Ligand binder design. Structure first.
Ligand SMILES: Nc1nc2cc3nc(NCCc4ccc(CCO)cc4)[nH]c3cc2c(=O)[nH]1
Ligand SMILES: Nc1nc2cc3nc(NCCc4ccc(CCO)cc4)[nH]c3cc2c(=O)[nH]1
Ligand SMILES: [Cl-]
Ligand SMILES: [Cl-]
Ligand SMILES: [Zn+2]
Ligand SMILES: [Zn+2]
Lengths: 370, 370
């Protein structure tokens, strides 16, 4: 049987790595993209379709699920895996970001109280407990995603609180034997865009010790240049021998650049959400299928894509569906976009394994931005 | 290779029949239920899923498709089958009903002019042409669905116009060699609830000659007792050796009773539309999955149903999805309901074949209405 958690690096090129995370519910190939399944569904896809695209792991959200249908309810029903019909690993975000994004809130050292978008509470202890009730495989520490921009003083105070919360998260996780034995716990680095704070945060997290390390506090409006600048110094601060997870990222070019900077895991609502809105990813860049120019275009969404959508339906048909507001339009766009993202990750993994990732990155960018 | 059209009756019980329609694109088992795919999609289902439920044929709509994406456009793109990815037979309604249901309208002996829900025109000739452009396998005559209730005088005048239009439809269809050689044409009986008018309509249609005969002008608010009363005398008026198609029907009990009265084909938006709205069909009657009583119900939608939805997901999960407005909720409810309808048709076919349909009808009703 597979271990609770084992990350092995099979090949490297510069800062980029490729390998596998073994967990009880399955193997995760890295660098990995996690489709987002916020409300116990990857929107518009059956789990079998999510798997068919190549996904090894999906993301769920503590915040959304605690509100609807409820964490205790999901536990009573057998846990998130059984509930939604996905039997492979699930990573759950801790709520620290979504509560401040979507909720009225009252923040304190204890945690956050908030009104549902009914009053609810999150704290390191309650967040870890909810993730336990869901039966999450990768549990995220409860943190605070510092707003951007942040002054150095505010970024420091925020980061310091997150580090205290990281320790509380660690202890809550460890105190629950079943969770400690079957799931993994990732810490989340904060510190805004400031190198010294990022270093202090990395040091605090490494002292506590986690199974993996997320770079939090990015993809919050800073833009790619700044994000990459922060990754340049932040990722090397994390333990080399554990996965590095960049939360909420991102566009295909964001992913490529982040892998170049040592990131192993990603999640983003972009392929699903923008798919439903008519944006299809292609190797020649994104297209908006609603555009009149596609009304009689018999080509598939992308000329090379191996997904079932591109094997069977035309741009013209999908254009019609999206224009008409048809559910099948959302389904097809989403399946294609998630498949595209997985094919991107596969090309990244293969190119690193073959020592030609730098060339892949260059070729990818040249064509995607042509 | 299969013929253009051949209807064979394999077994009978009272007025009920079971058999097959062979067409170039496939075999249709009768009695048949046709999922509705109004805008070139059976809402929330891939065509492969529609087929997996057991459907042999689906319905499309002249009215909707002529408006969006356009009949000429679909022809340019290779026809409706290629466009939507359904390679089996498609029946298209002629527009005669939907124009008056959904459109401002100007009616005359020539046809109907209307404003899109841009000005458009339908006539027997244009309707048949549109169905040709779509590449329909079963083409419906362009008719007028008489409003209910109707006075005998108005019902007669309406029916008479429909019969003149039936002849024009016949001639338009026959004048187009490719269509005449590859598709079938069904006439539509009118006459409201009046036996003498139904007889005159049947006589007119039989004199013209069609590949099949629809009972039109029902499922327009008359209710089941009245519908059944009209079927009692109307169906025997139609040629015995051709299919009998009851347009727009209906609930499971409507279907059973109509088969008892000699109907071979059905279409209805109920399983798809009401599925999206949270209504699931079961052998113990419909349930509304949104009801709080299902929030922790681990049972499948129906206890016996063989569909993929009932094999994998709980009422509790689907309840959550529908409550949350999740697309997967629409997908799962729709697949189950269409599968239920097909299982109903299979049970009907098997019971007629075995000479126990009367008993099936009785047992079905006893349990469904318990
Ligand atoms: N616990 C925790 N979770 C996070 C989630 C995040 N998600 C982001 N970025 C998401 C931004 C994002 C928003 C919308 C769209 C789709 C538009 O069609 C894509 C990306 N940054 C994030 C930071 C954190 C963080 O520090 N801590
Ligand atoms: N050409 C032609 N087409 C028709 C379509 C019809 N469709 C009906 N009934 C449909 C009624 C109907 C409407 C909505 C729902 C779903 C609610 O969730 C179910 C049934 N009667 C009909 C009569 C005719 C007719 O004479 N001629
Ligand atoms: Cl999404
Ligand atoms: Cl529908
Ligand atoms: Zn594709
Ligand atoms: Zn079912």
């Amino acid at each position: 049987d597979r271990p609770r958690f084992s990350f092995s690096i099979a090949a490297r090129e510069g800062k980029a790595r490729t390998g596998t995370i073994e967990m009880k519910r399955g193997v995760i190939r890295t660098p990995a993209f996690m489709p987002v399944g916020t409300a116990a569904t990857v929107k518009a896809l059956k789990p079998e379709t999510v798997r068919a695209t190549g996904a090894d792991i999906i993301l769920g959200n503590t915040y959304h699920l605690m509100l609807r249908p409820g964490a205790e309810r999901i536990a009573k029903l057998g846990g998130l895996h059984s509930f939604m019909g996905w039997d492979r690993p699930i990573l759950t975000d801790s709520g620290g970001y979504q509560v401040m994004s979507l909720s009225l809130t009252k923040q304190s050292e204890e945690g956050v109280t908030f009104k549902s978008h009914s009053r609810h509470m999150l704290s390191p202890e309650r967040s870890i407990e909810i993730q336990h009730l869901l039966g999450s495989d990768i549990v995220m520490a409860f943190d605070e995603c510092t707003p951007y921009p942040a002054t150095p003083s505010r970024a420091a105070s925020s980061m310091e609180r997150s580090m205290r919360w990281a320790k509380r998260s660690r202890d809550a996780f460890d105190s629950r034997k079943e969770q400690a034995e079957n799931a993994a716990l990732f810490g989340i680095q904060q510190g805004s865009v400031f190198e010294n704070l990022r270093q202090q945060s990395a040091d605090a997290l490494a002292e506590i010790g986690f199974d993996g390390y997320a770079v939090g506090g990015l993809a919050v409006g800073e833009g790619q240049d700044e994000m990459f600048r922060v990754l340049d110094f932040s990722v090397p601060m994390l333990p080399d021998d554990k996965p590095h997870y960049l939360m909420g990222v991102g566009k295909p070019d964001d992913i490529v650049g982040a892998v170049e900077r040592g990131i192993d895991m990603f999640d983003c609502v972009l392929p699903t959400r923008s798919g439903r809105n008519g944006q299809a990813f292609t190797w020649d860049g994104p297209i908006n299928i609603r555009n009149a120019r596609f009304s009689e275009d018999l080509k598939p969404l992308d000329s090379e894509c191996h997904c079932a959508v591109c094997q069977k339906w035309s741009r013209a048909y999908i254009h019609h569906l999206i224009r008409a507001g048809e559910i099948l339009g959302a389904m097809l766009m989403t399946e294609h976009n998630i498949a595209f993202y997985q094919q991107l990750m596969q090309k990244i993994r293969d190119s690193i394994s073959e020592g030609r990732f730098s060339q892949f990155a260059q070729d990818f960018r040249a064509r995607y931005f042509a």
